Amino acid sequence: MKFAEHLSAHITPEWRKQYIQYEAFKDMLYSAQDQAPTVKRYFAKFEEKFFQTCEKELAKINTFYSEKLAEAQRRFATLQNELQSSLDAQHRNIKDLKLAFSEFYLSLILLQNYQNLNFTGFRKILKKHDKILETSRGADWRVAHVEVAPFYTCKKINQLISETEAVVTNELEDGDRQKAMKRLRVPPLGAAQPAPAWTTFRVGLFCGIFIVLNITLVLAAVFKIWPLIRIYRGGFLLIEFLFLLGINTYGWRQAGVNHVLIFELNPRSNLSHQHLFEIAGFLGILWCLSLLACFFAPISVIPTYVYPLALYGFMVFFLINPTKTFYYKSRFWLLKLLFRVFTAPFHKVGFADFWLADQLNSLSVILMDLEYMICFYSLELESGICHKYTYGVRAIVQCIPAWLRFIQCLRRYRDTKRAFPHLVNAGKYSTTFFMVTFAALYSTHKERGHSDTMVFFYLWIVFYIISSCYTLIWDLKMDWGLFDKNAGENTFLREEIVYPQKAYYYCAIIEDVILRFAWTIQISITSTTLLPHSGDIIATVFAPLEVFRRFVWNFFRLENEHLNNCGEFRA
Amino acid sequence: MKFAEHLSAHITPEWRKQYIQYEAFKDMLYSAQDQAPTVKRYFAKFEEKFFQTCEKELAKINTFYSEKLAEAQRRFATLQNELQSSLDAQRVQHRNIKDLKLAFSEFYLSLILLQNYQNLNFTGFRKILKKHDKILETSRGADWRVAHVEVAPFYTCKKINQLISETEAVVTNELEDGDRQKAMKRLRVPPLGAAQPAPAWTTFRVGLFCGIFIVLNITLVLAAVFKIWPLIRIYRGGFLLIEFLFLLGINTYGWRQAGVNHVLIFELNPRSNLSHQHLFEIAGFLGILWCLSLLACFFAPISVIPTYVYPLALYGFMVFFLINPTKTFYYKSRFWLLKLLFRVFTAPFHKVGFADFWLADQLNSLSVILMDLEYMICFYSLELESGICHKYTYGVRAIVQCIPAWLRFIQCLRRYRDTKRAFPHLVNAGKYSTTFFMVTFAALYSTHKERGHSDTMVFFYLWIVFYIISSCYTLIWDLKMDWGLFDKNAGENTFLREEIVYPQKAYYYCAIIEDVILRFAWTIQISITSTTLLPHSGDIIATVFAPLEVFRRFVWNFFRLENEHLNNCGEFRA
Ligand SMILES: CCCCC/C=C\C/C=C\CCCCCCCC(=O)O[C@H](COC(=O)CCCCCCCCCCCCCCC)COP(=O)([O-])OCC[N+](C)(C)C
Ligand SMILES: CCCCC/C=C\C/C=C\CCCCCCCC(=O)O[C@H](COC(=O)CCCCCCCCCCCCCCC)COP(=O)([O-])OCC[N+](C)(C)C
Ligand SMILES: O=P(O)(O)O[C@@H]1[C@@H](OP(=O)(O)O)[C@H](OP(=O)(O)OP(=O)(O)O)[C@@H](OP(=O)(O)O)[C@H](OP(=O)(O)OP(=O)(O)O)[C@@H]1OP(=O)(O)O
Numbered sequence A: 001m002k003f004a005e006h007l008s009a010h011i012t013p014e015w016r017k018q019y020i021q022y023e024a025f026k027d028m029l030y031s032a033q034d035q036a037p038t039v040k041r042y043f044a045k046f047e048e049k050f051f052q053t054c055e056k057e058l059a060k061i062n063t064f065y066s067e068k069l070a071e072a073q074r075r076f077a078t079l080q081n082e083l084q085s086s087l088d089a090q091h092r093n094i095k096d097l098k099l100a101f102s103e104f105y106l107s108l109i110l111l112q113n114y115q116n117l118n119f120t121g122f123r124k125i126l127k128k129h130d131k132i133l134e135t136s137r138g139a140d141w142r143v144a145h146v147e148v149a150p151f152y153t154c155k156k157i158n159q160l161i162s163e164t165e166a167v168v169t170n171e172l173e174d175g176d177r178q179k180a181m182k183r184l185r186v187p188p189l190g191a192a193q194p195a196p197a198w199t200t201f202r203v204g205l206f207c208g209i210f211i212v213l214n215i216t217l218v219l220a221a222v223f224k225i226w227p228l229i230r231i232y233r234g235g236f237l238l239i240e241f242l243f244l245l246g247i248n249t250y251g252w253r254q255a256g257v258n259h260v261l262i263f264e265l266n267p268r269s270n271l272s273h274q275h276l277f278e279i280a281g282f283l284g285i286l287w288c289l290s291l292l293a294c295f296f297a298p299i300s301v302i303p304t305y306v307y308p309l310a311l312y313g314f315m316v317f318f319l320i321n322p323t324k325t326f327y328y329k330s331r332f333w334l335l336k337l338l339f340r341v342f343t344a345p346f347h348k349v350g351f352a353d354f355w356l357a358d359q360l361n362s363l364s365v366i367l368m369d370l371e372y373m374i375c376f377y378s379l380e381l382e383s384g385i386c387h388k389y390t391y392g393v394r395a396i397v398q399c400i401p402a403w404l405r406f407i408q409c410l411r412r413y414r415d416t417k418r419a420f421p422h423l424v425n426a427g428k429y430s431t432t433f434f435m436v437t438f439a440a441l442y443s444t445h446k447e448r449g450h451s452d453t454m455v456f457f458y459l460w461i462v463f464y465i466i467s468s469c470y471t472l473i474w475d476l477k478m479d480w481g482l483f484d485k486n487a488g489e490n491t492f493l494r495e496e497i498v499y500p501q502k503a504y505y506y507c508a509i510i511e512d513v514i515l516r517f518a519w520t521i522q523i524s525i526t527s528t529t530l531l532p533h534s535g536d537i538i539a540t541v542f543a544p545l546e547v548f549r550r551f552v553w554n555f556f557r558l559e560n561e562h563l564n565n566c567g568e569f570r571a
Numbered sequence B: 001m002k003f004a005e006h007l008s009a010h011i012t013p014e015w016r017k018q019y020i021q022y023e024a025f026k027d028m029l030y031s032a033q034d035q036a037p038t039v040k041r042y043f044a045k046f047e048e049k050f051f052q053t054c055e056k057e058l059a060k061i062n063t064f065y066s067e068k069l070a071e072a073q074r075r076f077a078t079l080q081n082e083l084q085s086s087l088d089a090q091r092v093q094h095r096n097i098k099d100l101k102l103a104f105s106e107f108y109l110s111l112i113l114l115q116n117y118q119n120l121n122f123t124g125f126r127k128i129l130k131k132h133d134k135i136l137e138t139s140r141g142a143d144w145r146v147a148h149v150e151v152a153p154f155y156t157c158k159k160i161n162q163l164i165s166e167t168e169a170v171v172t173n174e175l176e177d178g179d180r181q182k183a184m185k186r187l188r189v190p191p192l193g194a195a196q197p198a199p200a201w202t203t204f205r206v207g208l209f210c211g212i213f214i215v216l217n218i219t220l221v222l223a224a225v226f227k228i229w230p231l232i233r234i235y236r237g238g239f240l241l242i243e244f245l246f247l248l249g250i251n252t253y254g255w256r257q258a259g260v261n262h263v264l265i266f267e268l269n270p271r272s273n274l275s276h277q278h279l280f281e282i283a284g285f286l287g288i289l290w291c292l293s294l295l296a297c298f299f300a301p302i303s304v305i306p307t308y309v310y311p312l313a314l315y316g317f318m319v320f321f322l323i324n325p326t327k328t329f330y331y332k333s334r335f336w337l338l339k340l341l342f343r344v345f346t347a348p349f350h351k352v353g354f355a356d357f358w359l360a361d362q363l364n365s366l367s368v369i370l371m372d373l374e375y376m377i378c379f380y381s382l383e384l385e386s387g388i389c390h391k392y393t394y395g396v397r398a399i400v401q402c403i404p405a406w407l408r409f410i411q412c413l414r415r416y417r418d419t420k421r422a423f424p425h426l427v428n429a430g431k432y433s434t435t436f437f438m439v440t441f442a443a444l445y446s447t448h449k450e451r452g453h454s455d456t457m458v459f460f461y462l463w464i465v466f467y468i469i470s471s472c473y474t475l476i477w478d479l480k481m482d483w484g485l486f487d488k489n490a491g492e493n494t495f496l497r498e499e500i501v502y503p504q505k506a507y508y509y510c511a512i513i514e515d516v517i518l519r520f521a522w523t524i525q526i527s528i529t530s531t532t533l534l535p536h537s538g539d540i541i542a543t544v545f546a547p548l549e550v551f552r553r554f555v556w557n558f559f560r561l562e563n564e565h566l567n568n569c570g571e572f573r574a
């Protein structure tokens, strides 16, 4: 029933063009029916055209199946050779070979699903054509040609699957089929797997509680010793980033962007956007409860400062929970990625490391707020000393994410020796160092008149412009790939675009243009004392805008990486 | 991946014992493999016994399929005869055509159920024989499947497919003017039971409403503990309605999980029926509105708006949400509920089915809403002696209290007239009339308390005796007639019946205890609310007890539906 959406959802995105165009055939049949007036000869011509189109589709399917089968056979031969070499050598290598075998099994199951779905679509479309035309020739065509097509009559895929199972059981799992087929089953994949009902209910409950608590917080703030905005901005930004990341995952899944392969995640087990929404909602509930406790201070004995810490500490615990609960696999993966990023020069830079470093570049406000909290606790607990004065440590903390990205680019240059991309990106990140340093120098010299304060102000202005232009150009031309020379119809874009609307691309371009300058202004204001009066308000307003810009950027960067190997993270 | 769960979720509950015993075969195979130590002789003996059991199961499946096929052929013949008679005959005609269409749809659903039985049994046989082959490392299971299972009548007979095709053709040619799509829109049978989960958006909305309701309840409690109109008497009805809807959603979920076919019992459409998630959604939305109204009453942020507008609107919206003509919000279920309510409130003039009696019982458990409505009518009539609407009792109050009992009593009388079977209907009528007697005696005692008639103590004693009488009558009817417990055929389940659908017997014992306690509590609450009785703490007692009455009516719904599914306790089916 309603095979169109079934086909659309169960199609492998990377092979979309190689599947049968069920919607195209439906449109052809409906148009022929509408244009039907000579009637018999017209119907005969339409039948001939439909059969020719079906023959073309069948030939395309057959050739794709043949090439995929040949590739699978070659990969199986290489894997068998590797396994034989490993046996001749006789732990980590065994695990890597097992992962490779799992990937090969997933590819084989994907090919099997492709052929099964193609046959089902052929049968359904021919049945629909027979029903509409009131003729049985469609069934005859299906039986004569489709039923005997090599792609449908070839069981080599099944034999390869069985051989893979036997090899894995005998050699890798030590003769126990129970160990095999677990991690080697390929459960439902893509959008074809509905999210758990309990997960959706939890997501809804958390969003509802978050909304009501936000309404209560606004009402209290309108009707009602410690900087609350500074302390809680980091948590709010983290929750917003998690929610927008869930939206990013949903869009990637809907748009056919194979983010799983790009991020090097397990195709069989993946974190759905619903899980990200659930985590964001729970964290937002905790954040709102802490803020409400701060505003009201229900328990008099417990001091106010316990409420924020108790939240953030819990968050840290939630991230580092040793127990295998609450998304333990994803949490451990995130911990490993964070450790690799913060020790960037000593590890090979994959796509995930660079992406997370960029996210930290966008979320630097959290680190800056942590430094401000440390200063406030150390000194305040001259009034407002941490806010009226700046120092080198503040600038270094601001630049830490840019330092990580710059060192990652240097490591990539060392590994690949390709000057252009990595060195240009390194310069694009060092613009941040220059701008922050000059802003800090100007702020320091403003108090103690050096007679060169205006020189530093001008240098900061030019470096601000340079950094904004550099970042915007890199985002538009390299991260997003837009403004390409191959745009046949998609002006200012590339030749291939996956998202349905180009208006989204144009709006994203405009928002990136505005928000790159906005974020540069926010960094300049926060890292120094440029605007001691309204600096906090502007920074607080701009940080969510920076997160939104970083969300749109993730969308389009993942879309470019999937379409083109812009990051050069894959062979 | 796990055909045991898939089968259990796809077996038609009515034929639960007529399917291959996949779990029993699994347990047998595991036990045989566990005790394996000579060895080949034991393996051969186990194989012989296992295949004897498989042959017995195949024979049972074939017999059941033959009986169902014969019944289907007879039903199709009768339907064809009725259709031919209707065609030869050509407002009553439209109803006859609609009834014929519904009967054809029901027969097609039965045919699809039989086909699903066939497919599931074949797949289970194949999957269990493959498992036996893998466990015993032999290919004899496949040979047995091919030689016997693959040639059994149940698997080789295609009479069901031909009957389906003939039914489709006849419905399209003589009931839809040749429109095959229109016929198939009603004949098609989507997945039934737990086969198809509810929409993700529905679950998300249910969760959102639940969270908002919880937070708003917390806010209301905080406002009442820290921060002209009786708000308890104005919001108790709404709270009880929301609680009853939530417990009804729980009841639907439990019925679906336990296999109790309430769709057939309630005569609901099997191709499209409301799920428990939709009931939770409605309950959560109504609870959100109720909490918002109560918060507005507590705070009254806008001063120009009078506080009495806040409750009214809420309840008004509820009424509007129940009589909304547009086909927007659960319009099918809303119209069905409106028709059922109209039939119940006009019981003697309509045939009493399961739905009408069940809804009348729900009203009986929800009589507090009518009492609160009458109290508010009094308050707006007189109070707007200051508190004259809670210090004296009048006949109208007792009549409004007994209205649900009157409806059930008249339903029982109509059923007795229709069937002429005196025992059940008349005993139930007396059970409901005990309510009239108790309420009347309580009202008489309350009225005579003020004046020294010297007959107030006799009225008190009459109220006491009839209170115990009503409590015992209702409890005995619930335990022995509604739930079908304390039967004679129960040789294993003590104090229960021979067959129990719910997983745990402890549920039944706790339900019995709670039924006793909350039946006594319900009688006390009705006595207190109908008449003065306690003039100071009666309000709080009634407010506390009404949720308990709803909970008792929810447990009773569970067990009554279970008993109806098992046995024809209500005699609403042939
Ligand atoms: C000062 C630093 C601030 C903290 C650092 C910044 C952000 C942290 C949050 C998210 C970054 C990770 C986003 C990855 C997205 C990839 C696409 C995707 O959505 O794919 C998901 C990514 O899921 C993940 O692994 C992690 C997702 C995030 C879950 C949230 C964890 C708690 C967050 C709060 C941290 C509290 C810190 C306190 C504040 C200082 C695939 O999931 P899987 O189940 O295949 O996981 C991999 C399992 N294998 C490897 C076995 C297949
Ligand atoms: C004393 C004051 C009033 C007391 C309370 C009155 C009524 C509430 C009681 C019961 C509601 C019906 C429960 C269904 C039981 C059968 C099991 C089942 O779940 O069956 C459902 C029936 O769904 C329902 O009926 C609707 C469920 C209830 C929704 C509540 C609506 C809002 C009420 C507003 C409050 C009104 C009072 C105003 C305030 C003063 C299956 O749905 P379907 O789509 O298969 O329906 C059949 C439709 N075909 C036959 C055309 C396919
Ligand atoms: O009787 P109708 O008209 O209500 O349904 C018919 C038709 O719908 P129509 O009105 O033309 O649009 C098919 O397409 P559709 O709408 O679902 O949509 P899509 O174009 O695929 O998106 C439908 O599903 P499908 O064959 O395409 O998957 C199929 O149902 P059903 O018997 O279950 O088919 P089986 O799976 O059991 O073979 C019926 O085909 P016929 O048996 O050959 O008459």
Ligand SMILES: O=P(O)(O)O[C@@H]1[C@@H](OP(=O)(O)O)[C@H](OP(=O)(O)OP(=O)(O)O)[C@@H](OP(=O)(O)O)[C@H](OP(=O)(O)OP(=O)(O)O)[C@@H]1OP(=O)(O)O
Residues within 6 Å of the ligand: A095, A324, A329
């Ligand atoms: O399955 P592998 O062989 O590829 O890797 C598994 C291996 O860890 P490694 O990589 O070698 O360091 C196991 O440790 P090990 O060698 O002592 O023993 P084993 O012989 O495997 O039992 C570990 O504990 P365990 O679960 O198996 O008992 C398991 O954790 P995980 O399932 O997350 O956690 P749980 O929630 O299930 O507890 C890993 O599963 P994955 O990471 O999903 O692949």
Ligand SMILES: O=P(O)(O)O[C@@H]1[C@@H](OP(=O)(O)O)[C@H](OP(=O)(O)OP(=O)(O)O)[C@@H](OP(=O)(O)O)[C@H](OP(=O)(O)OP(=O)(O)O)[C@@H]1OP(=O)(O)O
Residues within 6 Å of the ligand: A177, A178, A180, A181, A182, B001, B002, B003, B004, B005, B127, B130, B131, B134
């Ligand atoms: O676990 P593995 O990998 O070593 O072997 C599994 C495999 O058996 P296989 O080799 O074909 O005979 C499954 O068949 P499959 O989906 O590929 O499909 P096909 O029928 O071939 O198309 C079978 O599922 P199922 O379809 O019968 O439901 C599953 O049974 P299990 O989960 O118990 O579920 P149930 O018996 O309760 O249903 C077996 O697991 P275990 O029995 O636990 O060890």
Ligand SMILES: O=P(O)(O)O[C@@H]1[C@@H](OP(=O)(O)O)[C@H](OP(=O)(O)OP(=O)(O)O)[C@@H](OP(=O)(O)O)[C@H](OP(=O)(O)OP(=O)(O)O)[C@@H]1OP(=O)(O)O
Residues within 6 Å of the ligand: B098, B327, B332
């Ligand atoms: O339930 P029913 O079959 O007894 O009655 C149906 C009948 O109207 P009624 O309610 O009896 O007054 C249909 O038209 P009708 O009078 O010419 O009679 P027939 O039954 O064809 O003889 C009407 O079609 P429409 O114009 O809205 O599309 C449909 O409306 P609605 O519920 O919104 O359902 P939807 O079709 O939108 O899903 C009703 O429900 P259903 O057919 O189940 O759907």
Ligand SMILES: CC(C)CCC[C@@H](C)[C@H]1CC[C@H]2[C@@H]3CC=C4C[C@@H](O)CC[C@]4(C)[C@H]3CC[C@]12C
Residues within 6 Å of the ligand: A247, A250, A251, A252, A254, A255, A499, A504, A507, A508, A510, A511, A552, A555
């Ligand atoms: C601020 C002004 C100038 C522009 C604002 C444009 C915003 C609203 C645009 C920029 C990028 C857009 C997103 C780009 C891609 C997707 C994925 C798609 O599957 C759903 C819509 C979604 C999620 C878009 C929603 C709208 C969006 C977020």
Ligand SMILES: CC(C)CCC[C@@H](C)[C@H]1CC[C@H]2[C@@H]3CC=C4C[C@@H](O)CC[C@]4(C)[C@H]3CC[C@]12C
Residues within 6 Å of the ligand: B250, B253, B254, B255, B257, B258, B502, B507, B510, B511, B513, B514, B555, B558
């Ligand atoms: C505190 C005591 C007196 C109350 C009586 C015990 C309560 C907890 C018992 C009485 C009947 C029981 C229910 C009976 C049937 C079902 C259906 C099943 O699929 C899930 C559990 C569920 C929903 C039970 C939950 C527990 C329950 C509600």
